[PDB]
Nucleic acid binder design. Sequence first.
RNA 1: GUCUACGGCCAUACCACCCUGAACGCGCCCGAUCUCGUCUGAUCUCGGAAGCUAAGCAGGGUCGGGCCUGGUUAGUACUUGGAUGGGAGACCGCCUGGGAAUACCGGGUGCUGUAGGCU
RNA 2: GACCUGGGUAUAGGGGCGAAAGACUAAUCGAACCAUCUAGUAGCUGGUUCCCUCCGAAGUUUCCCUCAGGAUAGCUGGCGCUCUCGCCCACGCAGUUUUAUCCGGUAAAGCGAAUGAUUAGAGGUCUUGGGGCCGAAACGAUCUCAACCUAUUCUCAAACUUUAAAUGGGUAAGAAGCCCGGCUCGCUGGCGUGGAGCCGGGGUGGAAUGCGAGUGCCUAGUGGGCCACUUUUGGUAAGCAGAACUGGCGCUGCGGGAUGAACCGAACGCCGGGUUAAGGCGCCCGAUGCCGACGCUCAUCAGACCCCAGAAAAGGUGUU
RNA 3: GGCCCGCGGCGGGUGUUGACGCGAUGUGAUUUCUGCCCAGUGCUCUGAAUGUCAAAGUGAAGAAAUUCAAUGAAGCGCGGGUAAACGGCGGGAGUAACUAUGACUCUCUUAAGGUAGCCAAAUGCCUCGUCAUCUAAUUAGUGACGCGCAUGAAUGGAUG
RNA 4: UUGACUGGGGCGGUACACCUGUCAAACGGUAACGCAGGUGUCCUAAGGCGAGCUCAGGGAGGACAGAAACCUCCCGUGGAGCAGAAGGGCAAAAGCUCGCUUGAUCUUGAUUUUCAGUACGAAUACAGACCGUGAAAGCGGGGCCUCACGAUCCUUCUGACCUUUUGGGUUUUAAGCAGGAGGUGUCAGAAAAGUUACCACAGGGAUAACUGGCUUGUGGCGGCCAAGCGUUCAUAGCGACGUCGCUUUUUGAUCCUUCGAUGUCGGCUCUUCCUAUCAUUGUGAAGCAGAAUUCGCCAAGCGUUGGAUUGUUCACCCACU
RNA 5: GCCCGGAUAGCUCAGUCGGUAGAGCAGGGGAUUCCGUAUCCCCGUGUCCUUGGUUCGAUUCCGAGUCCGGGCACCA
RNA 6: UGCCCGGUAGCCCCGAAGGUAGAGCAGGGGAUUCCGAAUCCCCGUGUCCUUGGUUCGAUUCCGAGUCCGGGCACCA
RNA 7: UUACGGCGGU
Lengths: 157, 208, 105
Amino acid sequence: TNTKGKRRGTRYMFSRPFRKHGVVPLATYMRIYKKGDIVDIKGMGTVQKGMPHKCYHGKTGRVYNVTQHAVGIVVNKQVKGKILAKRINVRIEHIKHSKSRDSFLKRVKENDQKKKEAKEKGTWVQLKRQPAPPREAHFVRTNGKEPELLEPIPYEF
Amino acid sequence: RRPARCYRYCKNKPYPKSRFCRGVPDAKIRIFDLGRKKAKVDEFPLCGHMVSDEYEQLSSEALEAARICANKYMVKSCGKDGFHIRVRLHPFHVIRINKMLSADRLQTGMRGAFGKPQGTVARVHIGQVIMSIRTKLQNKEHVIEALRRAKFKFPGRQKIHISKKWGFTKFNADEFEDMVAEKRLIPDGCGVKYIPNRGPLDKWRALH
Amino acid sequence: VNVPKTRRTFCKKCGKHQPHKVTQYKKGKDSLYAQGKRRYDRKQSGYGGQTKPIFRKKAKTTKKIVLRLECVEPNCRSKRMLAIKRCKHFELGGDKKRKGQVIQF
RNA sequence: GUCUACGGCCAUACCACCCUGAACGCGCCCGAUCUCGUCUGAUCUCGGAAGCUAAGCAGGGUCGGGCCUGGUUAGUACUUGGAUGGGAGACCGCCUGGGAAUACCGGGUGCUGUAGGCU
RNA sequence: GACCUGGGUAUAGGGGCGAAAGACUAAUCGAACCAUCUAGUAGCUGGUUCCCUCCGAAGUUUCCCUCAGGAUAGCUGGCGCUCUCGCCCACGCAGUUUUAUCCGGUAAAGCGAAUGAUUAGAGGUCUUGGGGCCGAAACGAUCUCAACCUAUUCUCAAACUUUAAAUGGGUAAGAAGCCCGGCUCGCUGGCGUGGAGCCGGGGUGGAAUGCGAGUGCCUAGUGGGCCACUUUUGGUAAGCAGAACUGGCGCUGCGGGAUGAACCGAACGCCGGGUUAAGGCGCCCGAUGCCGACGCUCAUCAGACCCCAGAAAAGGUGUU
RNA sequence: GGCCCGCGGCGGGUGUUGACGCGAUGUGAUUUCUGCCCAGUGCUCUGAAUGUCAAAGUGAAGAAAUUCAAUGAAGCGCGGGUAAACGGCGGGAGUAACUAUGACUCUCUUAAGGUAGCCAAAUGCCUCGUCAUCUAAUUAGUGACGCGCAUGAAUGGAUG
RNA sequence: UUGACUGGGGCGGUACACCUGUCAAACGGUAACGCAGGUGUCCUAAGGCGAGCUCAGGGAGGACAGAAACCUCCCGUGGAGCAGAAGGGCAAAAGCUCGCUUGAUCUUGAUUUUCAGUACGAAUACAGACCGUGAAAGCGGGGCCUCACGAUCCUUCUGACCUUUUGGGUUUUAAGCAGGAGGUGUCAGAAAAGUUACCACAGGGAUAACUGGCUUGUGGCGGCCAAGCGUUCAUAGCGACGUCGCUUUUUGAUCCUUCGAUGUCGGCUCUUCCUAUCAUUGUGAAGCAGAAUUCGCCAAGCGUUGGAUUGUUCACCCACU
RNA sequence: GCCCGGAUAGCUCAGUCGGUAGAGCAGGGGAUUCCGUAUCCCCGUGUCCUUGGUUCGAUUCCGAGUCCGGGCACCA
RNA sequence: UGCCCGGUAGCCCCGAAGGUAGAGCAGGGGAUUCCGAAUCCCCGUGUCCUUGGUUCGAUUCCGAGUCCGGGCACCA
RNA sequence: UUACGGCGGU
Ligand SMILES: [Mg+2]
Ligand SMILES: [Mg+2]
Ligand SMILES: [Mg+2]
Ligand SMILES: [Mg+2]
Ligand SMILES: [Mg+2]
Ligand SMILES: [Mg+2]
Ligand SMILES: [Mg+2]
Ligand SMILES: [Mg+2]
Ligand SMILES: [Mg+2]
Ligand SMILES: [Zn+2]
């Protein structure tokens, strides 16, 4: 029916976006991937040698293996009724650093040190984050003028 | 040719004449402007549109009978070369025919059911103009009656709307003469070429 | 497909790259007294007729041509096999083509 | 205040035309005996240092064209969920939450890394 | 008379006999009858015997001479087991939101942006294609259609696209985390470099809400599905064929839709009192037998309540 | 000996028979004709003319199993015959002094290209063919016609 | 013994193994005998590396020379090429030309894709040899990527100074071990012609041939608009180009009911119903003088025949009315 | 009432190599012969079916309409 | 699956084994005849299905590698 | 051995 081919539904997603064709920027290769670095997968279209599949494009995994030109990444794949820890070799052009934990890594760094500021100063700063609370009972001011009377416009085509 | 009840309401995704179709006959409309096409902008100030009320398909063949019905009427009172009729929507949607019994069950059943091209229709949206004529301001009542006779050849519902613009342009007719006068608009035939104040200054020296 | 008369490849008997003679392989004489021929000749004997399937519904028109690589350096004399993706027309030493012809069909 | 060598981000850096360029540099340049390469010392390679900022290059300019950024367009077009809503239908309005795109208008026009020299 | 018949006689089952019809062969013949092998085989029909309690499906994946069937995974039940809460913090998890951070090319929009279609005029001129003349003849001299270009303008695209939503998808939101000290390496290599590993030490309150989890074995039934929102393919359409998401029916009674598989409420142990939902309240038929409010409408075919069971264009000095 | 039966026998049937016989087919009285094709399929016949072709036997190599070579029965292949054997009997080009047609000429396929007769027949789709006749009226009937989907010569043709 | 799929089966086709764009509803997945196509190859270079170069096109020039030869300059973001079907990719390049080469070699595992999370096939990242190229970094273990292929059993060849050939030795032979090939296109892989009107059995409304039901293309019957027809004059009567419905007396589409059976064409016979009215009753309008006709209205009360041909419904003809 | 090739002078017909519209019958005019037959030669006659597209080039290629003939034909 | 044969001018066919490419047909011309018809002669017409190989050059001579047409064998 | 034709009227 449906031609179960590798690289099948990627008429658009294995393409360079627009006016970013040509040869690749070189700081793509001067990235440092250690074990446990959380990386996400976005397969390009210029390098043919190590593009993953159309199931990992847009997903995020974690580096378990580092070699000369590629990186082993352990991702989760939704197959029918269970998800599977799967491990793929992907060349280094197709990935980047996930910034999803990098806004967690600030608030473990500036949270551990602000904890020990309350031990020298003596308070209960409550360093845990809260959601957006309901708005405070504030006070609006119509100083000078009076409010504007608006009304719905008539219908004209 | 089947009735237009069969080929009405926009059901299929649009299927135009391309290298994938390759078997489509010609549309019965081939000319689209039929008044005095050569006129300038100030020669016909007002215009009057007919505007669709519903989202349907008008056939290429119905647009033929409508513009003949309006060009015939407006040479009778407004006279030959005293108007400029323009039919605005163009037929690009190719309808298909499942031409069976080509009295027998013998050809197929519904087996190979994708049909052959049979005509062209124009998909029209709610609020989209179909025809548009422009005349003198003295001939305003003949605009409505020409569009009134034309709407009996269309399915569905259409309303006739006397516009707020200057002819077939996009600028309002109240301040058109106020603003073509000094510099901002130049007339090029039956249209208006808006000039901004942001080009090279050399063409501003070419103006004045 | 044109693959030449000589070829420098790896031979396992010494463990080097060194040249070879490459020729087309043929299937060889189907010998009697093999185990599945000694079995087939006693099963097919007697009454009963044809006793194992004779295949007739042939579909492929080519064969994977294989080459025998004979190691050329003396006192080795060690052969092997190597395959190529299948082809219809198989030349061995036929005049390496130049890219400046005047083809003229 | 700039340049050279090597770079990063890859048009706010491009393209067309036009003005200016102290000093070091980069170039144009002047030559084929060797190295080398050609139909051709044009290119490439090699020896120079009489000239010249003419060009490239660098700065600036253009109611410039692109590009970048923001207004309008527009709470519009679409859309999540909802109704024993409307309508013969096609479609529409409301409730609940999100929410664009062009024309049109304006503002911008390379930023910096390491090493070295002029000023 | 190639006549009709009695009795005797011969021909016996893949055989007989036939002026031929596959006729006849003991009411049996396109292969007799009788007994046996034999309770022959059947992916196909029909049937399959007491009660109560508790849990509770599937019509989909892949392979098969597979398509009326099986093997396989899913869904199911039974058996447990490992533990957690019993009495300034849950080990953990989630068909959820938030906080960030990625991903995507559909709706829309766009084509005075590329590809592909497409209408109209304007302006300009190298020209040829063709006309108009000064004329033996002279790219000596003067116009028109076209073509070409330039700036605009009308209309589009499942297999076009700069731009680009809503819904959606992934990850992260701590003790397996953070920091420090040292030492192994045959890997890497200007370098007490780099990276892994190992040992030791230091500080636990790290979004909202809800909830007890983890784990193994054995395993039946199922493998024809059907309907409705919304999204969509073929078709003129279909109570038509085929998908997507969710809910239902099948397996499910009850109240309302007169009637009913699927609509609207709502899910069920056996009762008493109270209240409601959807829907109603002339009389069948419980409830307006309210001194209900405001209008619209007269039909010689009135109208009358989701799905749902009857109507369009057009028209009316009928009334509002 | 031919044609047959038969598990078996030189056992039986035709056969107490002998070519005016027995056995096997086809067509179907009489009268009258039975045209053309041996390529195909059969059948048949012949010469160490000859390709392919099994065992057994012959020769070689070998320790032997074995291997190899040579030689060559019928059959098929090759050549002839045969259609009262099964069957087949289409096209295409030129060509007559009106057009039309083709007595004539020449080709292909594959051997030959439907002769004499007969027909909308129990065989003709179109078709209720056309014309005549019969009836007031005829998809009927009969008689004619004849590039006859797809007539035709012991598949017997036409008669009577 | 006589494949399967199949809007019944047959004929056809391959939707039976595989690839591209779409469908597909912005992760992935997703159907139809849905759309547009392709595949059973080809290549010692079209593989590998390195170097140099720039393409399609257009302009302006140059003996013949012209739309098309070659030479030169300029512009030229890919508008060309990359074997081929498409899509993606590519510019001191993955293209074009040249110079060396065989990494299209040897070997163990891991992983991805299809997926049951099995296999083949294809692919990816390594690791260990041995090589090629380049000044070198590097790149290379086939084709720029997405397709281009195949189990067990058997055969055959190759490999080690290998194991077993049964009481022990020697030698042929035979069997093993490891991996290439000889295939199963119905492509997870049986060894395969019909016919049955003489037929039979087990079934199936999962499945055709009737009626019915939904639908109404097609048939039939109407409405609207009105350029023209009608001497004049759109509308007495018509009416093109359109366009909106109705009906289920036609034909189809469908496959819901019926296969442990609903007796299947036509004629005869007889009854009742419908109106979309041929006649008759009462009317209105004409391009209605009369007569004869036509178009409408209330209207189904009452009538709507006799025959030749044909099984015919239908058709056609004679005659009455 | 579905499909395959054709639309061309008075007719009829081939070729319309992507570059002309040319055989031939009918008429015209000659020549021929004592005169005619036949003959032989020359002249006439092409929207190359209609429109749109593809190059100093299309009747010719590509496919739209119209027309003309020639045809796929199940069990029930 | 190996054995056994055959491959040409524009179409059939001669040989041919070590020494040249030849009967007929068709085309184009002559000649013959008072003239046609028949007839006779001449031209033009050839990598022999294509890659090699000793001798002495070479389609052959030679058997090989190749493609068209035909042989009797049969285990995935 | 092969040798077939010769427009009409004058
Ligand atoms: Mg030199
Ligand atoms: Mg030199
Ligand atoms: Mg120089
Ligand atoms: Mg300078
Ligand atoms: Mg300067
Ligand atoms: Mg500047
Ligand atoms: Mg600007
Ligand atoms: Mg919604
Ligand atoms: Mg609801
Ligand atoms: Zn060796």
